[PDB]
Symmetry: C3
Subunit: 386 residues, 3 copies
């Protein structure tokens, strides 16, 4: 009852869905880039898009297209690499779907169905950018962006909030109430630390007036929540603050979930600046203190990832954006950054490498003269070698 | 009296001007894409650009360059495929020029001269995006955008209007007065149906306050004109309306001229949304009622064409835009969409295919949860097959 | 004391740093384009970026990255082609560095250190787009943009000014006070003519309210300065003025330093227009009068260079921008235009070619009808040949 191109297409998918990934000539001493993305719109199973019944669909047309899969939460569940990816269909709404692999640089395959998540309100128009936390309390939390319309004359005006839901398998989800932030009407780039702080749940947040425009409101705020089941945040202490003429000028916020090291919380975050061609996103790093995570103790100058070569172009071009990372027990680190809001790539590093960077890469000299002196010094002691 | 590179360049043109076009591996069950565009700036004849006289131009330089040819009206005149293309020169003004072929996917060649069209006013700065209607009244109408300056401090501020002119050969044009819309100071994406409605001329329009910003003013309005020779439209009834978080959020409007089918008027239109990198244009479809063309009876969720691969980049990137289509007698359909305001491509479909899409592709579920359920159902009945 | 990838990387650089450049099939009768850029971020010496000491940098990571090198002043010092390039690091600040060659289309190599330039104030955040003038007074002046923050709530709000500094070798620089313009709070695209005018120093300027938005304020103004050591400009006489629906609509300004010919000052300048995808920059030309440089005597319609093929994409895409040019004694001309604020290319022409263009390429007909007639006439006298 098939229609018979299906067999052939299903055959080409499998070839892509198993396509071997290779490392690129790219070097900087910190991470490695790879030739192919780990997830594309081509990766979504065809029976999520096509109706294979020959009677109600005779030409064999795509009934529900996928436009993009990007910004993806990452977590290692048991011994499989799990990517809770943001999948965007042709209708512009995004939803979550899990993809699994055993190598982390290739072989990712979506599950049987996409992720089901109870709407709390009925004006929840779409959800995105989930960050995954394997907390010490036993659960796995997904904290994600919830976008609703503002009832205004401007059809484009929408309000953003932060929603929380818990799982243990990634199939079943318990939708907890949305996080409340009392000194901030909207929230973006919210994420939960894997450990308690003063016997409470710890968040990184971005307070803001709403919703394209950051408020006052300098950057990434640290907040404590008494109970996650009814999460409330009265204060948000400032950590990474945006600075004029840095990589953070217009915006900045958390990316991958905080990663615990012996020297502190490694936050692979993102910064936004305004350019003549629109907004430019890049991926930078910063380390906060283990016993005091509101305290930035490492913060290099500039960025770690920027759009590079064919990463430059997509639906929202000159954007790189990480939602999540995977840390192996031996020291291996996998960073899942999307490019141009169209595809998901992988960058490979280690804890010691990523810690070498941030403590030892020089902080921002902030002004051209001091920057020149800063570079001159390095040149001056590289020549006092040969 | 030649200068003698001309012979060689004229020889390479002919090779491009006759270059065979091939179909691409692209599939979705609805249309086919092709390897090469049907018209580029390279297609314009060199004696429109170069002065071949060796005395007044010794280095053989280009005196009047072409920067782009895009958004093109389409009509089958006699048995030739005719493309009234928008040609933009280096001086940023656009004008119309006709290109003809007998295959429709290749071999397009411009005429002897470009299209001459009487300015009605003397502050008509430029004209563009003509839609061609072979009306039942005998004539062929070109309804197009007329752009004038607003006498304001902002040099960029301009007013848009809709101009009409009739022909039978595409060489000679009778400029009729500009369409008047009384409940709307400006007009874009205006087009004329091939049949009468209540013994009158039928338009699709986009009412608007002006001119980058849509007013109130929800979308594509249907209007009746008593006489085309002095065209007046008092009311515009709303058809396709823009919706929050759809493909239409910021803007939307007509594309190719309405195409009559047995089930209704097939309108291949366009939608615009705001992104961090600027505005994104896509091509979608909707069907209105034969006896009541203000009544949308089919309207799928999402789009039909979006910028794809090297279509992504040009002078105004991430734009696809159709001005016109060509329908053969047997059922063949040719859609002429431009990419990034630089080149004109072709998409090949049929009436029954394009009708399968729009009636049977699911309408917009509007919110992520309902979208997920909508996709889940399809997945659930594709598995109840194998 | 080396770490030993360095030797290998240093070996690949040398191959790029010596890579032969070839001419492209590109033709228009005026300039030639080349296959490779003359300067990239790959061109910067690795000991400006890497710490080769194995003890303080064990993984051999890049400590001070380069994100781009673009908009470059050009001057022939003795018999070497010198490019004072704008180098941008990962921290978003720009600085100047000199690169030298003997062919001008290839083989460019940076100096030992980057350019040292005394900050006059301590809130000078960054400097860029230096134009180089070998004046008749003996010196070489660099007039460049100085960007400071405005002490406002908007972190993005910055004020621009024009700074001057003199040299004879390009290593040592005497920072003179910033140019004062009394009828204009900010200045961009300022440059100095190589000759005196009425026994004074002659500037082209762009007066402006600040700083993304041009004021009133029509375009490129000519100004006279009594003494360069304390440079003051009371009046700026208008030359090239921006016009609605031209290549100059939103912005325009000087590019390469004025080039003296027998028929006038050849100014290879730039124009900016607003598009749905952001701002579009192109390179155009105009000639002013030798004894009266505020008087435009040649000004063709449109542009000379626009973003082409892979020039289209970078950090600020659809931008071409020249800072400087090199004129040989025999008639050879080298134009150093950057693309998309990422790389620096070269266009090759001659004085007589570039003079043929501007006097003989038709001026702007300003409106579509007159443009069509203008092109029609040329077509009409190209056919009255064969």
């Amino acid at each position: 009852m098939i229609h018979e191109k299906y067999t052939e297409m299903r055959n080409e998918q499998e070839a892509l869905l198993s396509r071997k990934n290779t490392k690129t000539s790219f070097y900087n001493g910190i991470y490695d880039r790879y030739e192919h993305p780990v997830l594309t719109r081509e990766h979504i199973p065809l029976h999520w898009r096509y109706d294979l019944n020959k009677e109600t669909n005779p030409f064999f047309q795509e009934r529900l297209g996928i436009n993009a899969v990007f910004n993806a939460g990452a977590i290692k569940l048991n011994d499989r690499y799990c990517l809770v990816a943001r999948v965007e269909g042709n209708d512009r709404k995004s939803f979550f779907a899990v993809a699994e692999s055993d190598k982390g640089t290739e072989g990712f395959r979506f599950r049987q169905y996409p992720v089901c998540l109870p709407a709390l309100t009925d004006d929840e128009t779409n959800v995105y950018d989930m960050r995954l936390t394997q907390h010490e309390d036993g659960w796995i939390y997904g904290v994600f962006c919830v976008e609703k319309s503002a009832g205004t004359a401007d059809l484009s005006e929408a309000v953003a909030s932060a929603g929380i839901a818990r799982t243990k398998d990634l199939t079943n989800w318990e939708r907890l109430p949305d996080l409340v932030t009392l000194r901030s009407p909207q929230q973006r780039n919210v994420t939960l630390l894997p450990e308690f702080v003063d016997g409470k749940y710890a968040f990184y947040t971005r307070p803001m007036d709403g919703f394209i425009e950051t408020g006052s409101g300098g950057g990434i705020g640290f907040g404590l929540a008494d109970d996650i089941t009814h999460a409330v945040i009265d204060e948000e202490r400032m950590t990474s603050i945006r600075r004029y003429h840095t990589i953070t000028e217009s915006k900045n916020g958390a990316g991958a979930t905080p990663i615990k090291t012996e020297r502190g919380w490694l936050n692979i975050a993102h910064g936004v600046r305004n350019t003549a061609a629109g907004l430019r996103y890049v991926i930078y790093c910063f380390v906060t203190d283990l016993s005091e995570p509101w305290k930035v103790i490492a913060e290099p100058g500039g960025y770690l990832i920027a759009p590079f070569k064919d990463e430059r172009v997509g639906d929202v071009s000159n954007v790189v954006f990480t939602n999540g990372a995977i840390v192996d027990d031996n020291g291996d680190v996998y960073i899942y950054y999307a490019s141009s809001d169209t595809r998901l790539h992988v960058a490979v590093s280690s804890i010691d490498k990523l810690l070498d960077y941030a403590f030892n890469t020089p902080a921002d000299a902030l002004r051209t003269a001091e920057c020149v002196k800063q570079r001159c010094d390095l040149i001056k002691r590289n020549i006092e070698l040969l």
